[PDB]
């Protein structure tokens, strides 16, 4: 049977909150079968646990935030992308503050942390959600859709005026496995637009934001092409974000996601629309590994 996975070891890291600019202490811990990913705010008394589930997503701009009452965890998308990428079913994520550390602005540092802690197979069937019927949402001319597909395919197109994009759209698609996630998408940084970052900095926001965690762009271009890791890196980052957002399903997905100018808000609308549409998906488990669609990093 394809087994559920947790971490083999407790593993700690330190980084800066993207908005706070202050140190955050991150602890990844093993968790029992059927826990899913649980964020835990250990700076609070009592401790506040928020399951990484679609229903717990708060309404925020340009990042995925989890909310329980007045308590929040900001910027969960990159860590959840790494958890999805290496097939981590079950873990506690402890934080000293309301933000996941931004690290280098990709999932790379998180992949290194999870890899290094090691993958522990657990004595329970891994549950997958198989898309059974097409589900789409539209907002203006933005679109996000799931369709049935035997695998995990994530496709994305973006279209912007800014001269950095050279008058054209950026398109990319990943046929997802642990290997293709790590290689094609995991280190992709987003564009930090100088005009936007300066505006946020005047409000004592994005204090942790810099060339260390974004590709900085001026009125016309990437200032340092040196800092680029991929072609069409911006859309490859959109795929990274999506994989992290789609993991708020609480299980590995079997089907195809196509995003047209989508983002965290519309991804979350699609997710919640799919969950509410009970005949459009089913939970499956696999007794013979060799007939499962998705390749994951061997433990
Ligand atoms: C733009 S998006 O829709 O792709 C969403 C991107 C979002 N997931 C993200 O990674 N933002 C991000 C990362 C590092 C720095 C930063 O702030 C800075 F540096 F830009 F201010 C912002
Ligand atoms: Cl479409
Ligand atoms: Mg239906
Ligand atoms: Zn991102």
């Amino acid at each position: 049977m394809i087994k559920q996975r947790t971490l083999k070891n407790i593993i700690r890291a330190t980084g800066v909150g993207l908005h706070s600019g202050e140190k955050v202490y991150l602890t990844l811990k093993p968790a029992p079968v059927d826990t899913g990913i649980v964020f835990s705010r250990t700076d609070l008394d009592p401790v506040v646990e928020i399951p990484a589930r679609a229903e717990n997503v708060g309404e925020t701009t340009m990042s995925t935030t989890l909310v329980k009452g007045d308590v929040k965890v900001d910027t969960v998308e990159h860590l959840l992308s790494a958890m999805a990428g290496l097939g981590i079913d079950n873990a506690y994520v402890e934080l000293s503050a309301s933000e996941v550390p931004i690290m280098d602005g990709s999932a790379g540092p998180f992949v290194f942390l999870i890899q290094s802690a090691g993958l522990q197979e657990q004595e329970a069937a891994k549950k997958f959600i198989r898309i059974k019927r097409e589900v789409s949402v539209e907002e203006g001319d933005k679109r996000a859709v799931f369709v049935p597909f035997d695998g995990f395919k994530v496709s994305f197109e973006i279209d912007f005026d800014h001269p950095v994009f050279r008058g054209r759209t950026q398109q990319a698609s990943v046929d997802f496995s642990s290997t293709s996630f790590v290689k094609e998408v995991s280190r992709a940084r987003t564009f930090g637009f100088m005009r936007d970052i300066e505006y946020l900095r005047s409000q004592n926001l994005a204090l942790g934001g810099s060339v260390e965690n974004a590709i900085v762009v001026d009125e016309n271009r990437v200032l340092n092409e040196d800092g680029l890791r991929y072609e069409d890196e911006f859309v490859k980052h959109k795929i990274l974000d999506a994989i992290g957002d789609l993991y708020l399903l609480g299980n590995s997905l079997i089907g195809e996601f196509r995003g047209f100018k989508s983002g965290h808000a519309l991804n979350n609308q699609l997710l919640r629309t799919l969950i509410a549409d009970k005949d459009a998906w089913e939970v499956v488990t696999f007794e013979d590994a060799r007939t499962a669609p998705i390749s994951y990093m061997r433990p």
Side-chain angles (χ1 to χ4, degrees), residues 45-85:
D45 187 32
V47 171
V48 180
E49 288 192 353
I50 310 173
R53 306 296 295 253
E55 72 185 306
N56 295 326
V57 170
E59 174 160 27
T60 92
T61 77
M62 301 304 171
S63 220
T64 298
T65 303
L66 296 175
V67 173
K68 199 208 205 94
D70 50 351
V71 172
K72 55 182 196 145
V73 179
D74 292 313
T75 306
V76 301
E77 59 265 18
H78 299 166
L79 173 46
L80 284 173
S81 194
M83 294 288 180

mmCIF file of all heavy atoms in Angstrom, residues 45-85:
data_model
loop_
_atom_site.group_PDB
_atom_site.id
_atom_site.type_symbol
_atom_site.label_atom_id
_atom_site.label_comp_id
_atom_site.label_asym_id
_atom_site.label_seq_id
_atom_site.Cartn_x
_atom_site.Cartn_y
_atom_site.Cartn_z
ATOM 1 N N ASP A 45 -0.058 31.630 24.648
ATOM 2 C CA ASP A 45 -0.471 30.811 25.824
ATOM 3 C C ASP A 45 -1.967 31.021 26.055
ATOM 4 O O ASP A 45 -2.387 32.121 26.408
ATOM 5 C CB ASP A 45 0.342 31.155 27.077
ATOM 6 C CG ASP A 45 0.087 30.235 28.266
ATOM 7 O OD1 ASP A 45 -0.203 29.032 28.050
ATOM 8 O OD2 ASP A 45 0.180 30.725 29.406
ATOM 9 N N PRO A 46 -2.825 30.003 25.814
ATOM 10 C CA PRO A 46 -2.384 28.683 25.346
ATOM 11 C C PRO A 46 -1.922 28.688 23.877
ATOM 12 O O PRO A 46 -2.199 29.647 23.169
ATOM 13 C CB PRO A 46 -3.657 27.838 25.465
ATOM 14 C CG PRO A 46 -4.758 28.843 25.212
ATOM 15 C CD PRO A 46 -4.289 30.097 25.922
ATOM 16 N N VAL A 47 -1.269 27.605 23.446
ATOM 17 C CA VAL A 47 -0.771 27.441 22.051
ATOM 18 C C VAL A 47 -1.990 27.430 21.123
ATOM 19 O O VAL A 47 -3.015 26.862 21.524
ATOM 20 C CB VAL A 47 0.078 26.166 21.911
ATOM 21 C CG1 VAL A 47 0.418 25.867 20.457
ATOM 22 C CG2 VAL A 47 1.339 26.256 22.763
ATOM 23 N N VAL A 48 -1.910 28.077 19.957
ATOM 24 C CA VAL A 48 -3.022 28.062 18.960
ATOM 25 C C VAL A 48 -2.616 27.218 17.739
ATOM 26 O O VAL A 48 -1.659 27.579 17.052
ATOM 27 C CB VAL A 48 -3.463 29.483 18.577
ATOM 28 C CG1 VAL A 48 -4.605 29.450 17.566
ATOM 29 C CG2 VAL A 48 -3.853 30.298 19.811
ATOM 30 N N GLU A 49 -3.361 26.142 17.494
ATOM 31 C CA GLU A 49 -3.173 25.206 16.360
ATOM 32 C C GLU A 49 -4.148 25.627 15.261
ATOM 33 O O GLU A 49 -5.327 25.918 15.569
ATOM 34 C CB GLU A 49 -3.395 23.751 16.789
ATOM 35 C CG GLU A 49 -2.287 23.189 17.673
ATOM 36 C CD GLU A 49 -2.322 21.672 17.879
ATOM 37 O OE1 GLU A 49 -3.295 21.029 17.435
ATOM 38 O OE2 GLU A 49 -1.371 21.123 18.476
ATOM 39 N N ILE A 50 -3.661 25.720 14.030
ATOM 40 C CA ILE A 50 -4.523 25.945 12.842
ATOM 41 C C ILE A 50 -4.167 24.905 11.787
ATOM 42 O O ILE A 50 -3.085 24.956 11.203
ATOM 43 C CB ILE A 50 -4.360 27.369 12.292
ATOM 44 C CG1 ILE A 50 -4.495 28.439 13.371
ATOM 45 C CG2 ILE A 50 -5.349 27.586 11.155
ATOM 46 C CD1 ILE A 50 -4.182 29.848 12.886
ATOM 47 N N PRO A 51 -5.055 23.925 11.525
ATOM 48 C CA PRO A 51 -4.852 23.007 10.413
ATOM 49 C C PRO A 51 -4.740 23.774 9.084
ATOM 50 O O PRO A 51 -5.513 24.701 8.842
ATOM 51 C CB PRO A 51 -6.089 22.100 10.484
ATOM 52 C CG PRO A 51 -6.502 22.156 11.937
ATOM 53 C CD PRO A 51 -6.249 23.595 12.323
ATOM 54 N N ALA A 52 -3.772 23.365 8.263
ATOM 55 C CA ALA A 52 -3.546 23.868 6.901
ATOM 56 C C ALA A 52 -4.669 23.328 6.015
ATOM 57 O O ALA A 52 -4.411 22.388 5.252
ATOM 58 C CB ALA A 52 -2.177 23.445 6.430
ATOM 59 N N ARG A 53 -5.877 23.894 6.134
ATOM 60 C CA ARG A 53 -7.070 23.469 5.346
ATOM 61 C C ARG A 53 -7.724 24.689 4.676
ATOM 62 O O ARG A 53 -7.620 25.785 5.197
ATOM 63 C CB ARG A 53 -8.085 22.705 6.211
ATOM 64 C CG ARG A 53 -7.516 21.509 6.966
ATOM 65 C CD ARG A 53 -7.039 20.438 6.014
ATOM 66 N NE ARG A 53 -8.159 19.893 5.262
ATOM 67 C CZ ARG A 53 -8.708 18.689 5.439
ATOM 68 N NH1 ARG A 53 -8.247 17.859 6.357
ATOM 69 N NH2 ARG A 53 -9.736 18.324 4.685
ATOM 70 N N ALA A 54 -8.353 24.484 3.518
ATOM 71 C CA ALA A 54 -8.848 25.546 2.628
ATOM 72 C C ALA A 54 -9.786 26.482 3.389
ATOM 73 O O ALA A 54 -9.749 27.719 3.151
ATOM 74 C CB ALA A 54 -9.545 24.916 1.443
ATOM 75 N N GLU A 55 -10.643 25.878 4.213
ATOM 76 C CA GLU A 55 -11.701 26.539 5.003
ATOM 77 C C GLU A 55 -11.074 27.531 5.981
ATOM 78 O O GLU A 55 -11.776 28.488 6.332
ATOM 79 C CB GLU A 55 -12.541 25.486 5.739
ATOM 80 C CG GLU A 55 -11.806 24.825 6.890
ATOM 81 C CD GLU A 55 -12.520 23.681 7.599
ATOM 82 O OE1 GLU A 55 -13.672 23.889 8.052
ATOM 83 O OE2 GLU A 55 -11.900 22.585 7.720
ATOM 84 N N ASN A 56 -9.828 27.307 6.412
ATOM 85 C CA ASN A 56 -9.126 28.196 7.376
ATOM 86 C C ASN A 56 -8.372 29.332 6.652
ATOM 87 O O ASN A 56 -7.650 30.048 7.336
ATOM 88 C CB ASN A 56 -8.151 27.414 8.262
ATOM 89 C CG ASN A 56 -8.839 26.418 9.164
ATOM 90 O OD1 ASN A 56 -9.943 26.676 9.610
ATOM 91 N ND2 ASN A 56 -8.214 25.275 9.420
ATOM 92 N N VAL A 57 -8.455 29.461 5.324
ATOM 93 C CA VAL A 57 -7.744 30.555 4.602
ATOM 94 C C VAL A 57 -8.500 31.866 4.845
ATOM 95 O O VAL A 57 -9.727 31.908 4.552
ATOM 96 C CB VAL A 57 -7.590 30.244 3.097
ATOM 97 C CG1 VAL A 57 -7.082 31.457 2.315
ATOM 98 C CG2 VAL A 57 -6.673 29.041 2.888
ATOM 99 N N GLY A 58 -7.795 32.890 5.329
ATOM 100 C CA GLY A 58 -8.324 34.257 5.484
ATOM 101 C C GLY A 58 -8.251 35.021 4.180
ATOM 102 O O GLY A 58 -7.583 34.559 3.275
ATOM 103 N N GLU A 59 -8.952 36.138 4.066
ATOM 104 C CA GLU A 59 -8.984 36.956 2.822
ATOM 105 C C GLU A 59 -7.850 37.992 2.891
ATOM 106 O O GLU A 59 -8.025 39.008 3.597
ATOM 107 C CB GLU A 59 -10.373 37.579 2.635
ATOM 108 C CG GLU A 59 -10.431 38.546 1.468
ATOM 109 C CD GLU A 59 -11.813 38.849 0.916
ATOM 110 O OE1 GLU A 59 -12.798 38.741 1.693
ATOM 111 O OE2 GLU A 59 -11.888 39.194 -0.295
ATOM 112 N N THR A 60 -6.728 37.723 2.211
ATOM 113 C CA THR A 60 -5.509 38.579 2.181
ATOM 114 C C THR A 60 -4.912 38.613 0.768
ATOM 115 O O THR A 60 -5.133 37.660 -0.022
ATOM 116 C CB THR A 60 -4.430 38.119 3.177
ATOM 117 O OG1 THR A 60 -3.531 37.209 2.537
ATOM 118 C CG2 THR A 60 -5.006 37.497 4.432
ATOM 119 N N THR A 61 -4.119 39.650 0.504
ATOM 120 C CA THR A 61 -3.546 39.970 -0.828
ATOM 121 C C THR A 61 -2.141 39.355 -0.934
ATOM 122 O O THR A 61 -1.382 39.432 0.055
ATOM 123 C CB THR A 61 -3.606 41.487 -1.058
ATOM 124 O OG1 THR A 61 -2.569 42.121 -0.310
ATOM 125 C CG2 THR A 61 -4.932 42.094 -0.650
ATOM 126 N N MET A 62 -1.855 38.696 -2.069
ATOM 127 C CA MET A 62 -0.502 38.324 -2.592
ATOM 128 C C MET A 62 0.230 37.318 -1.678
ATOM 129 O O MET A 62 1.425 37.057 -1.933
ATOM 130 C CB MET A 62 0.365 39.574 -2.791
ATOM 131 C CG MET A 62 -0.238 40.595 -3.759
ATOM 132 S SD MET A 62 -0.609 39.924 -5.415
ATOM 133 C CE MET A 62 -1.510 41.298 -6.138
ATOM 134 N N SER A 63 -0.468 36.729 -0.701
ATOM 135 C CA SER A 63 0.009 35.591 0.124
ATOM 136 C C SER A 63 -1.173 34.785 0.657
ATOM 137 O O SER A 63 -2.300 35.335 0.736
ATOM 138 C CB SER A 63 0.860 36.060 1.239
ATOM 139 O OG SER A 63 1.934 35.166 1.385
ATOM 140 N N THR A 64 -0.930 33.527 0.999
ATOM 141 C CA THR A 64 -1.954 32.662 1.589
ATOM 142 C C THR A 64 -1.766 32.763 3.101
ATOM 143 O O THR A 64 -0.675 32.448 3.569
ATOM 144 C CB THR A 64 -1.919 31.239 1.015
ATOM 145 O OG1 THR A 64 -2.190 31.311 -0.387
ATOM 146 C CG2 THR A 64 -2.968 30.349 1.638
ATOM 147 N N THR A 65 -2.826 33.168 3.794
ATOM 148 C CA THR A 65 -2.894 33.322 5.268
ATOM 149 C C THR A 65 -3.895 32.304 5.810
ATOM 150 O O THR A 65 -4.958 32.145 5.218
ATOM 151 C CB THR A 65 -3.251 34.757 5.671
ATOM 152 O OG1 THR A 65 -2.275 35.615 5.082
ATOM 153 C CG2 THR A 65 -3.271 34.984 7.176
ATOM 154 N N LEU A 66 -3.541 31.643 6.908
ATOM 155 C CA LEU A 66 -4.466 30.810 7.697
ATOM 156 C C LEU A 66 -4.937 31.595 8.923
ATOM 157 O O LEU A 66 -4.140 32.339 9.492
ATOM 158 C CB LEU A 66 -3.748 29.529 8.122
ATOM 159 C CG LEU A 66 -3.311 28.602 6.990
ATOM 160 C CD1 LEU A 66 -2.498 27.443 7.555
ATOM 161 C CD2 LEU A 66 -4.504 28.088 6.216
ATOM 162 N N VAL A 67 -6.179 31.364 9.347
ATOM 163 C CA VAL A 67 -6.835 32.174 10.418
ATOM 164 C C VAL A 67 -7.637 31.239 11.311
ATOM 165 O O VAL A 67 -8.349 30.384 10.743
ATOM 166 C CB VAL A 67 -7.716 33.272 9.790
ATOM 167 C CG1 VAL A 67 -8.549 34.029 10.821
ATOM 168 C CG2 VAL A 67 -6.854 34.230 8.998
ATOM 169 N N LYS A 68 -7.468 31.377 12.629
ATOM 170 C CA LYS A 68 -8.394 30.871 13.685
ATOM 171 C C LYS A 68 -8.768 32.050 14.601
ATOM 172 O O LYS A 68 -7.893 32.545 15.326
ATOM 173 C CB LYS A 68 -7.735 29.737 14.474
ATOM 174 C CG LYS A 68 -8.687 28.834 15.247
ATOM 175 C CD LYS A 68 -8.045 28.200 16.474
ATOM 176 C CE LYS A 68 -8.692 26.904 16.925
ATOM 177 N NZ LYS A 68 -8.007 25.724 16.343
ATOM 178 N N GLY A 69 -10.009 32.530 14.526
ATOM 179 C CA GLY A 69 -10.422 33.786 15.185
ATOM 180 C C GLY A 69 -9.526 34.955 14.796
ATOM 181 O O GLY A 69 -9.469 35.268 13.603
ATOM 182 N N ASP A 70 -8.831 35.568 15.758
ATOM 183 C CA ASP A 70 -7.982 36.775 15.549
ATOM 184 C C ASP A 70 -6.502 36.366 15.400
ATOM 185 O O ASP A 70 -5.633 37.269 15.247
ATOM 186 C CB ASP A 70 -8.193 37.798 16.672
ATOM 187 C CG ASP A 70 -8.089 37.242 18.092
ATOM 188 O OD1 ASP A 70 -8.022 35.994 18.253
ATOM 189 O OD2 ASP A 70 -8.106 38.060 19.042
ATOM 190 N N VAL A 71 -6.220 35.061 15.434
ATOM 191 C CA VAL A 71 -4.846 34.488 15.302
ATOM 192 C C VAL A 71 -4.615 34.074 13.835
ATOM 193 O O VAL A 71 -5.502 33.443 13.248
ATOM 194 C CB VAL A 71 -4.682 33.307 16.274
ATOM 195 C CG1 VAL A 71 -3.382 32.544 16.064
ATOM 196 C CG2 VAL A 71 -4.818 33.760 17.720
ATOM 197 N N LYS A 72 -3.455 34.407 13.272
ATOM 198 C CA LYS A 72 -3.147 34.164 11.835
ATOM 199 C C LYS A 72 -1.763 33.538 11.714
ATOM 200 O O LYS A 72 -0.933 33.720 12.617
ATOM 201 C CB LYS A 72 -3.229 35.457 11.018
ATOM 202 C CG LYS A 72 -2.355 36.585 11.548
ATOM 203 C CD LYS A 72 -2.462 37.883 10.767
ATOM 204 C CE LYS A 72 -1.311 38.813 11.100
ATOM 205 N NZ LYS A 72 -0.882 39.612 9.929
ATOM 206 N N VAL A 73 -1.564 32.772 10.647
ATOM 207 C CA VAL A 73 -0.219 32.401 10.133
ATOM 208 C C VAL A 73 -0.132 32.850 8.662
ATOM 209 O O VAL A 73 -0.906 32.338 7.866
ATOM 210 C CB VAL A 73 0.021 30.893 10.293
ATOM 211 C CG1 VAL A 73 1.390 30.510 9.745
ATOM 212 C CG2 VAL A 73 -0.155 30.434 11.735
ATOM 213 N N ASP A 74 0.742 33.806 8.355
ATOM 214 C CA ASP A 74 0.947 34.403 7.006
ATOM 215 C C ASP A 74 2.041 33.643 6.259
ATOM 216 O O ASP A 74 2.931 33.109 6.912
ATOM 217 C CB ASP A 74 1.349 35.873 7.084
ATOM 218 C CG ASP A 74 0.246 36.778 7.600
ATOM 219 O OD1 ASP A 74 -0.890 36.645 7.118
ATOM 220 O OD2 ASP A 74 0.533 37.592 8.493
ATOM 221 N N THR A 75 1.952 33.646 4.932
ATOM 222 C CA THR A 75 2.963 33.134 3.969
ATOM 223 C C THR A 75 3.184 31.634 4.208
ATOM 224 O O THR A 75 4.327 31.207 4.351
ATOM 225 C CB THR A 75 4.200 34.036 4.024
ATOM 226 O OG1 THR A 75 3.706 35.363 3.796
ATOM 227 C CG2 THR A 75 5.246 33.674 2.994
ATOM 228 N N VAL A 76 2.110 30.858 4.217
ATOM 229 C CA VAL A 76 2.197 29.379 4.326
ATOM 230 C C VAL A 76 2.519 28.732 2.958
ATOM 231 O O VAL A 76 2.929 27.577 2.969
ATOM 232 C CB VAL A 76 0.928 28.799 4.977
ATOM 233 C CG1 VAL A 76 0.727 29.384 6.366
ATOM 234 C CG2 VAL A 76 -0.311 28.976 4.115
ATOM 235 N N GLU A 77 2.377 29.429 1.830
ATOM 236 C CA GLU A 77 2.322 28.778 0.495
ATOM 237 C C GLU A 77 3.630 28.035 0.142
ATOM 238 O O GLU A 77 3.546 27.004 -0.548
ATOM 239 C CB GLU A 77 1.920 29.773 -0.607
ATOM 240 C CG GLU A 77 2.844 30.965 -0.743
ATOM 241 C CD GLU A 77 2.415 32.213 0.004
ATOM 242 O OE1 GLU A 77 1.548 32.101 0.953
ATOM 243 O OE2 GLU A 77 2.993 33.286 -0.324
ATOM 244 N N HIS A 78 4.803 28.534 0.526
ATOM 245 C CA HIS A 78 6.091 28.044 0.013
ATOM 246 C C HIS A 78 6.434 26.764 0.775
ATOM 247 O O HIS A 78 6.798 25.778 0.143
ATOM 248 C CB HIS A 78 7.158 29.134 0.049
ATOM 249 C CG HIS A 78 6.853 30.339 -0.774
ATOM 250 N ND1 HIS A 78 7.561 31.507 -0.627
ATOM 251 C CD2 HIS A 78 5.934 30.569 -1.741
ATOM 252 C CE1 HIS A 78 7.067 32.421 -1.436
ATOM 253 N NE2 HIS A 78 6.085 31.876 -2.133
ATOM 254 N N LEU A 79 6.256 26.780 2.091
ATOM 255 C CA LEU A 79 6.424 25.577 2.933
ATOM 256 C C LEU A 79 5.406 24.510 2.533
ATOM 257 O O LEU A 79 5.778 23.343 2.427
ATOM 258 C CB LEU A 79 6.274 25.978 4.398
ATOM 259 C CG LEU A 79 6.262 24.837 5.404
ATOM 260 C CD1 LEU A 79 7.370 23.827 5.134
ATOM 261 C CD2 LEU A 79 6.400 25.409 6.803
ATOM 262 N N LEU A 80 4.150 24.871 2.352
ATOM 263 C CA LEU A 80 3.163 23.848 1.948
ATOM 264 C C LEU A 80 3.536 23.317 0.561
ATOM 265 O O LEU A 80 3.271 22.144 0.268
ATOM 266 C CB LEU A 80 1.758 24.443 1.958
ATOM 267 C CG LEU A 80 1.131 24.641 3.332
ATOM 268 C CD1 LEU A 80 -0.183 25.399 3.172
ATOM 269 C CD2 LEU A 80 0.915 23.313 4.054
ATOM 270 N N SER A 81 4.130 24.139 -0.290
ATOM 271 C CA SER A 81 4.521 23.665 -1.633
ATOM 272 C C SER A 81 5.582 22.579 -1.443
ATOM 273 O O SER A 81 5.421 21.547 -2.059
ATOM 274 C CB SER A 81 5.005 24.771 -2.510
ATOM 275 O OG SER A 81 5.061 24.319 -3.846
ATOM 276 N N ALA A 82 6.539 22.779 -0.521
ATOM 277 C CA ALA A 82 7.649 21.836 -0.234
ATOM 278 C C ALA A 82 7.086 20.543 0.356
ATOM 279 O O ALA A 82 7.519 19.470 -0.053
ATOM 280 C CB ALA A 82 8.654 22.474 0.705
ATOM 281 N N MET A 83 6.136 20.653 1.284
ATOM 282 C CA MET A 83 5.440 19.490 1.881
ATOM 283 C C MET A 83 4.732 18.691 0.781
ATOM 284 O O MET A 83 4.894 17.452 0.737
ATOM 285 C CB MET A 83 4.435 19.939 2.936
ATOM 286 C CG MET A 83 5.054 20.582 4.170
ATOM 287 S SD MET A 83 5.913 19.396 5.224
ATOM 288 C CE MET A 83 6.497 20.470 6.531
ATOM 289 N N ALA A 84 3.957 19.347 -0.074
ATOM 290 C CA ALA A 84 3.308 18.691 -1.225
ATOM 291 C C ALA A 84 4.366 18.021 -2.111
ATOM 292 O O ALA A 84 4.149 16.870 -2.571
ATOM 293 C CB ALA A 84 2.460 19.677 -2.006
ATOM 294 N N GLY A 85 5.445 18.733 -2.402
ATOM 295 C CA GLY A 85 6.483 18.289 -3.345
ATOM 296 C C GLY A 85 7.153 16.998 -2.907
ATOM 297 O O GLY A 85 7.410 16.171 -3.776
#
